[PDB]
Every structure is written in structure tokens, then in C-alpha cells.
Design a protein around this ligand. Sequence first.
Ligand SMILES: N[C@@H](CCC(=O)O)C(=O)O
Ligand SMILES: N[C@@H](CCC(=O)O)C(=O)O
Ligand SMILES: N[C@@H](CCC(=O)O)C(=O)O
Lengths: 415, 414, 415
Amino acid sequence: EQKTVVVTTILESPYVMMKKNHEMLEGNERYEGYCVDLAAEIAKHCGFKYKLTIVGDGKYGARDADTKIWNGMVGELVYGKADIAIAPLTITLVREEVIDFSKPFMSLGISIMIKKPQKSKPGVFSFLDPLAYEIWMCIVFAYIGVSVVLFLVSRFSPYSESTNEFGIFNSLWFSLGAFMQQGCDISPRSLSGRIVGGVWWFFTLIIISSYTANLAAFLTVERMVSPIESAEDLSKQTEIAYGTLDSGSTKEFFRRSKIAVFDKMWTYMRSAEPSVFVRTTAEGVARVRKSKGKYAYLLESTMNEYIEQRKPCDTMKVGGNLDSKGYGIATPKGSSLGTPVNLAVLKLSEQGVLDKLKNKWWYDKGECGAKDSGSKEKTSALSLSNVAGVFYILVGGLGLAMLVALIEFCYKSRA
Amino acid sequence: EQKTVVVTTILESPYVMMKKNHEMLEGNERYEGYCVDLAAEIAKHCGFKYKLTIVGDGKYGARDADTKIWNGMVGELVYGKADIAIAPLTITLVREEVIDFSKPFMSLGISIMIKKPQKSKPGVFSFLDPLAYEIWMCIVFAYIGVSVVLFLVSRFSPYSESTNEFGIFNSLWFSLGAFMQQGCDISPRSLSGRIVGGVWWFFTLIIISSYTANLAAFLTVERMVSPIESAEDLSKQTEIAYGTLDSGSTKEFFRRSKIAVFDKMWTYMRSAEPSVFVRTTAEGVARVRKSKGKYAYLLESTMNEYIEQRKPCDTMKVGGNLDSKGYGIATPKGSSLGTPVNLAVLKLSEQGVLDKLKNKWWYDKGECGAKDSGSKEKTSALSLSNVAGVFYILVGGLGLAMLVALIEFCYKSR
Amino acid sequence: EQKTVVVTTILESPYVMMKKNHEMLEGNERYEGYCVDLAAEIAKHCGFKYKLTIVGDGKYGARDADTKIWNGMVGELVYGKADIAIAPLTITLVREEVIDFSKPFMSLGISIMIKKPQKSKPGVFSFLDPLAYEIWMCIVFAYIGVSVVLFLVSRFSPYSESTNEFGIFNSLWFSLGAFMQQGCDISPRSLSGRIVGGVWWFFTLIIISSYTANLAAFLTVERMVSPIESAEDLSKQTEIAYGTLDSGSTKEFFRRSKIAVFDKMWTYMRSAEPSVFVRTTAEGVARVRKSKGKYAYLLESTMNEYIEQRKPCDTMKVGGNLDSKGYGIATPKGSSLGTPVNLAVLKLSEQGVLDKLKNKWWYDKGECGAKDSGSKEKTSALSLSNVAGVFYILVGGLGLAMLVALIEFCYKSRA
Ligand SMILES: N[C@@H](CCC(=O)O)C(=O)O
Ligand SMILES: N[C@@H](CCC(=O)O)C(=O)O
Ligand SMILES: N[C@@H](CCC(=O)O)C(=O)O
């Protein structure tokens, strides 16, 4: 009988996660996730029994401080503690020097995580907005003042009281009709009444003109620039602190890179204090979430798009990928598995099972994915939900007017 | 033997700034800055080891009158206490007489620093602003012309007619109602009157449609005014005092100058009290901040533009450069360093390292809103302070209407 | 006795130019310009007598093509043909290695020349512009059609002709008052007259609104972008061909430079065909001017800003300076003249005479003082020259109305 394969892996969602009944299930059954499905498929094609394990120290693998010793997941392969690795492990030159990688099974880049700056919800009565509350209150007091002054001037000695129609109720209707610019049925024929009319016409002209001009702005623009994605412009500021994972390939990439913007970013990240780095990706996400949008974490696009699709969905991804990298299955130098694993990965990609495994785990759970991306269009029509408050005011006014008419009729009959 | 060289240099930002480690570390770690980088680049081209030392008295200096003794920075070179000087130090003829300068590495002029006024609120009568004054005159004259012509055309005594109700006062009211885009109770009802009406309606159509285009942006202009710009007005007044660094090249420039405006400014500086000079630049900048805008300081554009980047950014540059001068490395007469240092300066300027260090020290470290404030998203609502001017003329008109009514009544009653 | 100094120079405006009477004057008097003044000042300080000459082959000069020989200005200094050079000779490392340069007397950078895309003058009747010629004519025919249809319907059997006031002249006034949205005496009281009225009201609502909306666009922002500065277009497209002077420091700078965009520009300029280079600056300027704005020339700011003053003032400078360089007086290695000449240049700069020379030559003869750069503030008020056409139409209409009234009165009297 052949020896069982000692597979080794790392806990990371959705690649590997705990089963609900891990307290009672068998050691293999405790694990479920994307990598467990892939491992079963590869084993079924190659034909070996296998036993799962979790890496003893939870680090993806990096090179120690010139001691030439390797951290946990690469070390477990190199020092012969494990026989194969199946995990989200990136293909890099320094790893290729010591361990043999298959062809990639997924393609990915580097991406920024940020906390979303809320969403504005206009009220029912939004049309009131382009003028402040104090303006509406002062317009009401001005209307009452003009109405009573015009009555005092008109129904006061022409000597002859008949001459002027402007009782109170008519002066109040005249000034209301004047403010709406909806035309008139009488006009004053006296010097003092004409000066009060002409001043009210000027006030109306300026107030209505400025109201309709501002409306345009409020209804022709509604967007916010947000923190710029361009990493050079991110480097140009210190209000936000950004950091990578500890012992991850992203950190080695920033260390090794000599591109001027990336060298500047590494120079900041090496010299900045306190420690911006974290031990786990979930700790990085939580530290962004708690830090009131003041801190950022650097993480790779396949994990980013998973987190973006999970509640509470308060995160945003900005900008494109900075690079392009593959994940591949790794096996220890000079080992028989390397060729059949290569043919298995090719065959699975050629049938298309790998898309089925991604769909099953990433997007099937994408609860917030309903049309959240929106559009950048600038000529959208208005929609009835924006207007309804005016319809509610109109129908309430028709109800009130009909009630007043009925009580006036009943009183006039009884009186 | 490759002995270490001694550099003499002065603390000034961002040329030479104390690093926080300096309590813990040796002097070459203690300091960082643009001059430290440049000194490293020059040493790496020339190939020698170097030690950085601070000039004892902290003065660039000039030869004292009637004693003819040079003070600190020039003295260190002339008296052989240092091998080279690398600091912001200006090329001048009096120094060229005794020490050898490389080709200049940066160019600078003399500039005025002032404490900026806060942006002013727009005026009370802002609503009239979108149209020029000549338009409002021509509008008034057109209104008078139309009103009198429309009176003259009616009431023409045909071969008795009284149907044309357009007396002068009613014609003047009809024209006013037509311009405000308000309805009126009478209309011309004769051919010539209908021509005059139609033409006034077309004129009105254009005027309004070109004043209501942008009325809210003019209510929210947000900024205006500056106290001085000419860089000459300081010569004409004594209300604001202005002062230069002590012992600096700027002071010698003003002393030597025979330009009339500069000679007048020196004569003021030679006689005004209490002393306008300061012992360091930082003392001058602080004095400008404290003096509530009553005092200005004269300093060279690299300082002005650096200080403008740095918080709190309450200080600002106005006007152009008064003259053009270069900074250059200084070396002691007949020393062998002169030619390899000079060729190193040329090579570094041709490669462009000096531009990279300029951007890195001056401009990357900016923090105030001058770095970017151009988004100008839509101004929310429209507060009462912007509109209050229209309420005052309304209530004045109501008060006048009551006064006119009361005089009319009391006259009619007796 | 003294030995006359052989000064050598190059013809280039405004540094050196031909005197009007060069056919009759002495060989020294034939020349006048900024450098002749400077040369007289330096000679008056140093005290040597001098004789002017013009460099034979007329090139500033650069290291020859692997013959290791030097061309005209540097060669005439090195090989002992001349004793001093006074010209806009740029300080550069390769020249400093063989000849000695004084401190710089003027500062310059590299700048781009482009042909200005003309200007548009608004007409007297600009307010007509937000619509098209064909729309105004069709609005006139629609007004006539509605007027006559409304008459045909109203003054046609109510059975009673008195019932309708809408004779032709009243229908024509009613429809005019309707189109201005200015209100009117009377309204039709019949079904057919009300349908024709309501359709004319709808047409008026849509047409007027559009005009006032588009007026805003045509009344708000008017500007032109021009080709992008800083060689962005020149690096990113081949549509514009850009040349530099031959045997000039600019060409050596582009050859030597290793900055990525500058290296790309040199790679284009070396490989591009036909030859973009020129022998003289005036030829480069002329080649830009004739080439309908399709060709560009690279030249340093003192020339660019001088040429902007010159007629026909159709050139524009775009972008900032690319670098920083000085001109210095040059003297041949070990020559005694270098020590006093350097102090003379310092003294002249320290008194400020060089500013006076620049002001006199560039600015005081800069009589193209139109200074069309203007201002960029968007909140600019309207000006009477924009409006006057409406005032001319108003006053002509008042004159016509008053004449028609006089002829109607005279006919009424004679009839
Ligand atoms: N896939 C990454 C995980 C760590 C990171 O995102 O930097 C790796 O192999 O190192
Ligand atoms: N660079 C100047 C500093 C003092 C000043 O700005 O006047 C000098 O050499 O003295
Ligand atoms: N000032 C330039 C002239 C030639 C050019 O503009 O390229 C030089 O000294 O070479």
C-alpha cells in the first residue's frame, strides 16, 4: 500500500473555511472550501489518497533575515515536512528558485481598500432645498406686511370709499397672484398704491429668478470626487496611512521594486511609525473598518472582490490592478507529482470546471451585488419619486378647499 | 592622504534641518536637508570623506567697517578654518574679491511677505452686479424714451376723441408693468401704439433672458481685495513698516543701491524706530504673523515660497522679484577643489539631480489647501446674508408709500 | 602701444543687427545691438581697444562628427583666430572643458513655438446666434399661418357677425402677444378658436424655453484649448512635426538626454524624415509660419518672447521652461582677460545696467503692445458692446411708429 499524501494549506476565506460541525466531524470533514474541492479533483485525477493539515504557523512564506531559513508554508515543503501545497500561493522568482510550480489557475492583481463615503438620500420635499429655511420664513412675513400696507393705503380717505376695490381679501389675493407671476384681474390706480405695487414686483423678480437659477445646479450635478485611486496621488498625502500584510508577497514586491513611485511608497512604509502592518487579512480589514476611514490596507483583487460582496458591504475598491500574478500548485524540487499535477490543472482549465468553482463560491453569495455599480450618465430624466411631494400637497389642498366650501354652505344656510 | 574634509554650513529650512534622532546619533546622522544631499552628491563625484560642522556665530556675514575683519562664514574660508562651504550663500562682488565661487546652482530674487486678508463677503447691492453700470443708464433712458413716445402717439386730436386712456401717468405705468413681466389692464388698440408695444416687448425679452442666465454665481463670488501689490506703495506710505534681515546681502543691496525708490526705502530703514531688523528669518516671519498685518518682511523667493507651503499658511507673497542673483558653492582661493567641484556642479545640473531634489524638498512636503482646492462643488442652498439687500429696499418703499399717502390726505383735508 | 582685441560674434536679433547705414559707415559702426553696448561697457572697464568681426561659418558650434575638430565659434576661440567671444553662447559642460566662461549675465530655458489659431469677433446681432437662420424664417411663416387660420375660424358664421372681435388686425395682435408670453386683452370663446389657441400656446412654450436655455451656454463659457503644452502631443502623436536648430545646444541637449519622454522625442527626431532641422532661427520661424500650424520649432525663451513682440504677432508660446541655463562671456584657456572681465560682469549686474539694456532692447521697442492675454475669470459681467444691437432696433422702431402716426393723421385730415 502507498503512503497517503500529506497536503498542507492555510485558513483563508473562501479558499479554506471551518465547517459548521467541526467539533464533531472527522478531521478531513472539518474543512470545506474552494481548495478542498480542487484538492479532491486533483486527487481523483491523479489517484492518491490524501490527508489534510493546516500550516503550523500561519504565514504564507518569506526569507528570513539572511539566515537563509524559510517561513512556514515554503519551509514545510523545503524541509520535507509536507509533500504538496494547495493554497493561494503566488508564483514569484525567489520561490521558483527552490520549489516547482505548476501553471497558474487564476489571474489577479494588487488593489486598494477604502471605506465608502455614505450615500445621500434626498427627502420627499427636496424642491424646497435650494433656499434656506430662513428665506422661506422671511418671504412669508414680507407677504403679510405688503398685503396689509396696501390695504391701509387703498381703503383710506380718497376724499368716496367705493372708489377702491382693495378690501383686505382682495389685497391678499392681488399680492399672491403677483408673487406667482400668474397674472392679474385688477390693478391699483393711485400713486401710493402704485409705488407699493412696483416695489413688490421688483422683489418678486429677483427672488424667483434666483430660485430657478439655483435649482439647475442641484438638479444638474450630484457627484463626489472621492479619494483619488492613483497611487502616486495617494503617496502625495499623509492623512491616510496604508500598510501591507506581514510576510506576504506584496511586502516583498514593494521592498524589491525600484520604480520611483513604488520606491517612494516603500520608503514611507519602512520609515513610518507606528507599525502599519498586520498579522492577518481579517485584522487588516477590521483595522480599516474601525479606523473611521483614516487607514487603508493593501490586499489582492481576488480577496478584495470577495470582501466587497459580503455584508455589511461598507468597503470600496478603487483603481485598477497594479500588476499581474498567478497562483499555482507547488511541489518540492524533483518530485513525481509535478507532471501529473500539470496535466490535471490543464485538463481542469480546459473543461472549464475552474469557472464553476469560482461561481459556486465568490458570486453566488454576492448579496449586495444588485446594480450597485450605477452609471456615470449625466442626462438621466427625472423620476416620479422625486416629484411626489407636490402631488401630495395638491391633493391635500383640493380636499381642504372642498371642506371649506361645505362648511360655508351649511353656515350660510343656517345663518 | 585622503583626510576628511571640513564643511561649514548653517541651520536653515529645508536646507539644513535637525533630525529627531540627533540626541542619539553622530552629527552626520544628526542633519538632513537639501544641502546634505548635495554635499553627498559632490563628495561622491569627487571621491572624498567629509565632516559637517555648524558655523559658530550663525551669520553669513560681511566685513566690519573700519576694522576689515570678516565674521563667521566668510571668515571660516578666508582664515582657513574650513575646507569648503555648502550653504545657501549668494554670489556678490565683495566676496568674489577673496573667495572662489562655482557656477550657480539656483536662481532667486527679493520678494515681499505680507499677512493675507481673509476673503471678503460680497456686498449688499450684489444683485445689480451681473450688468455693467452703462447698461443700467441706457435702460433708464430707454424707459423714459418709450414712455414719452407712446404718450405722444396717442392723443392726436383727430378731425371729440377721448378713447385713448394713455395719459402720461398711465403710459409710464404700462411701460413699467411690461418690463417687470407683469400683466396690465390696458393695451394700445391703434396701429402706431401696437408698433411701440411690440418693440418694447422684444427689447424686454432679451434684457431679462441675459440677466437671469447667471444670478446665483454672482451672489456667491466669495473673494476680492488685496492690500498692496505694486511693491512701490511701501515707498509712498508710513502706515506699514518693512524690514530686512540683519547682516544679510539684502541689507548691503539696499545700502549700495542708487535707484531712487530703493534709496528712499533705505533712508526710511536708516531712520525709522524701533529697529525693523531681525537676527534670524524665523524671528521675522513670527513678527509678521504677530503684527496683525502692520509689518512686512523682505526675504528671498525660495524662502517665501517654502514658507507659503507650510502650515498655518497665513502668510503670502505679492509682487515680482526686484533683481536676479545666484547661489554658488564657495571654496578658498587657490585650493585644488575648485575645478572638480565646479565640473561636478555642471554635471549635476545637466543630469537634472538638482531639479529632483528641488521637487522633493520644496513641493512634495506641501500641506495647505493651495496644493489642491479646485473642485468647487455646487454651493449648497443660498443663505439670507446674500439676499438681505432686497428686503431693505422693500421696507424702505413701504415706508415711503405711507409718507406720501399721509401728506396727500392732510393736504386734501384743508 | 596697446594691441587691439579681436572680438568675434554672430548676427542675431536683438543681440546683433545691421545698422541702417551699413553701406556708408565704418566697419565697427555698421553693427548696433545689445551685445555692442555690452562690449563697449566691458571694454570701458578693462580699457582695451577692440575691433569687431563676424564669425565666418555662422554656427554656435558643437563637437564635430568623429573628426574631433571644432566648428565655428568654439573653433575660432580654440585655434587662436579670436581673443574673446561676446554672444548668446550657452554655458555647457563640454564647452567649459576647453574654454573658460564667466558668470552668467542672463537666464533662459527651452520653450515651444506654435501658431495662434486666430480669434472670433462677435457680431452686432449676436443674440440671434443660439438658433439657426432656418428656424427664424419658419417661425415667421408659422406666425402668419396661425394668424390667418384664427381669423377664418372666428369671423365665419356663428349663425351675428358682431359676436367675435377677431377681425384680422386683432387676430394678428393676439397671436403676437401670445408669442412674447406678454398677455393680451381677449381670448377666444369658441371651441375651434380655443383649439387653435391651445396649440399656439404649446408651440410657444417649447420654442422660447429652448432659446433661453441655449443662450446660457453661448453666454457662459467661450474658450479654445489649443495644442497641449509640454510636448504632450508632440510625444503622443506624429501629427505635428517639431524641429530644432542645427549645430545648437538644444540639439546636443536632446541627443545627450536620457529622460524617458526626452529620449522618445530624440528617437523621433533622429529617425523622422524629411529633415526637420534648419540652418537659421529666422528660417525655423518662417517654416512654422508658412506651414499652416502643422510644424513646430524649438527655441529658447529670450528669442521666443522677442519674436512675440515682432509683427505680425501671430505666434504663441505654450508651457513653461524645460530647464535653466546661462549665457556667459568666454575667453580662451589661460587668457588674462578672464579675471577682469568676470569682475566687470559682476559690477555691471550689481549696478543693474543689464536690466536697463534688456528693457531698452526687448521691451521699449515692444510696440505690439496689444497684450491680448486678457483675464480668465468666468464671472465676467456683460458689456454694452454686446447689447447695442437691441438698442438700435428699439430706436428705429420708435422712429417708424412715429412716422406712421404722422402719415395716418395727414391722410385722416385729407380724407
Ligand atoms: N497570495 C499572497 C498572499 C499574501 C498577500 O496578499 O500579500 C501570497 O502568496 O503571498
Ligand atoms: N544668501 C544671503 C542670505 C541673507 C539674505 O537673504 O539677505 C547671504 O548670502 O547673505
Ligand atoms: N543659445 C544657443 C543658440 C542655439 C540654440 O538655440 O540651440 C547656444 O548657445 O547654443
